[PDB]
Amino acid sequence: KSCPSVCRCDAGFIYCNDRFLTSIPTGIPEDATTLYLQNNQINNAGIPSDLKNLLKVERIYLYHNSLDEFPTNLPKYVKELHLQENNIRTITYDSLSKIPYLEELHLDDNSVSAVSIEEGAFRDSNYLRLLFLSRNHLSTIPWGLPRTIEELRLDDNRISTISSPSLQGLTSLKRLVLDGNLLNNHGLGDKVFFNLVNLTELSLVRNSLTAAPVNLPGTNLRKLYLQDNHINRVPPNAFSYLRQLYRLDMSNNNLSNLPQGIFDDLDNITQLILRNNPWYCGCKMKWVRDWLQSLPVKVNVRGLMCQAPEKVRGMAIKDLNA
């Protein structure tokens, strides 16, 4: 059991964190399982070639370091790579291929863009399930994302358009987060989400959505987050075929009408959250009262109250006569 004189080693956990390191010290034992290298000044030239031979390392924590390209010379069997808060710009096939067993990649707070990711970079990442790209320089969703991805976070980027090929064939994806990007209804491509058979959660919070998107996948969708947009209307087919949808949330949106029957396909809608919406209460909303009176006991609905006209502003919709 050797240990770098600068580090602390305990039963496979290698603590080299917060130690003003510009390179990884010599002397990490070959039974190392977890490398704590966070809160250092390590750059790519600081990662020695010998590191690749630490065959038992499954997790590397390299967040808050000085990497400006995807790290190379990594232990071959590493499964979890935490790279948040580096200056990483570019991802290449050579770097990704060298760690074929990677399951979890956290790249939050880096400078990755679509053009920076080499074409086919992920072709050999046949085990990658979790990819976090929050707070990067993405303008679009990269093409060629591994077909095995289950969770994809692209929040707080500058995404403007989504191409159907980019999400095409991501049949295992169940969680997609697109919060805080520059997406318009115009930006969403036709049927971009349609073929996400396994998708369970779709989050579009804090985008610039004006109308609820359409052609959402129903086979598996259970949660859809549209809160904190400016959605004035619900197209008649916005919730068509969403037979598994469990929670739907359009709080904090400019909803004044709900056309009759938009929830007709919501067979499983357990929690429906419609608070913080400017509900106009007139002829067109009479159905709501009845639909809420006939609403099943298990279903929990909240947030439906009149704001216009002035006379009945603030009065619960499910109670008004006319």
């Binding site: 602390r8 305990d10 603590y15 917060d18 704590y36 966070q38 967040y63 935490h82 976090f132 969770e151």
Partner: protein, 263 residues
């Protein structure tokens, strides 16, 4: 019932109440000892996604799954270490060594503080992981934080925290390797450290105490209940002298037996 009067030195721990089985293996729950009403606060642990605090107005509502409100937090949370104290939530902000204070009446972050040199984000968690590196605790003496540093070779460090300025008021290094502990809690300024079996060290007991009044520590052996073999949270409440425990999806409370106090 007096949350500022020391009940003594802990001598025994007993299962008291089994409330229900959560849908999440790990999490924490508690009451606010400086709050007159019987509110319950609930935060299941969901990796990479823990960002809400749920509030129930009664035990019946809690068991029925009927929240009074849910608080959307301004940042994600690491681990199961949160507390609620005089109407504020305190929690470890995800992938930081910082405590955030979030006022519940106004739903606004009212403070943040750095816990100097604390390891964080699955570096010195309790034994089950879950980014449980930093654990808050309330007792008769006030607000505490339980963590580890590399200066103390990964062993538990205790700091007393000012609940309004968020400045460390005192710091003590213990002799106990934090990752070896299942959990820990404070009573009367004494740290009690739990060792227990996990489903996947054959003893379930409090095997170590550190007394911050004296800066003195010792080995002990107080049997500690562990029916489900996955302790994710242990929170002491100085108002009712109970432990609020989350064990392998089970939300339960443990009663305590005390003997004459230490210095």
């Amino acid at each position: 019932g007096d949350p500022r009067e020391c009940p003594g030195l802990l001598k025994g721990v007993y299962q008291s109440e089994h409330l229900f089985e959560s849908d999440h293996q790990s999490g924490a729950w508690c009451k606010d000892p400086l709050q007159a009403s019987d509110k319950i606060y609930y935060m299941p642990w969901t990796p990479y996604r823990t960002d809400t605090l749920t509030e129930y107005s009664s035990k019946d509502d809690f068991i029925a799954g009927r929240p009074t409100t849910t608080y959307k937090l301004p940042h994600r949370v690491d681990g199961t270490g949160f507390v609620v104290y005089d109407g504020a939530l305190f929690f470890n902000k995800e992938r930081t060594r910082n405590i955030v204070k979030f006022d519940l009446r106004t739903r606004i972050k009212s403070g943040e503080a750095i816990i100097a040199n604390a390891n964080y984000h699955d570096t010195s968690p309790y034994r089950w992981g879950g980014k449980s590196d930093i654990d808050l605790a309330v007792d008769e003496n006030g607000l505490w934080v339980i963590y580890a540093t590399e200066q103390n070779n990964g062993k538990i460090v205790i700091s007393q925290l000012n609940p309004y300025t968020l400045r460390i008021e005192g710091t003590w290094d213990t002799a106990y390797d934090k990752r070896s502990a299942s959990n820990a809690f404070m009573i009367c300024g004494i740290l009690y450290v739990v060792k227990s079996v996990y489903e996947d060290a054959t003893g379930n007991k409090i095997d170590y105490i550190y007394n911050t009044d004296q800066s003195k520590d010792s080995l002990v052996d107080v049997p500690f209940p562990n029916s489900y073999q996955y302790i994710a949270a242990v929170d002491y409440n100085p108002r009712d002298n109970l432990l609020y425990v989350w064990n392998n999806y089970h939300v339960v409370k443990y009663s305590l037996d005390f003997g004459p106090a230490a210095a």
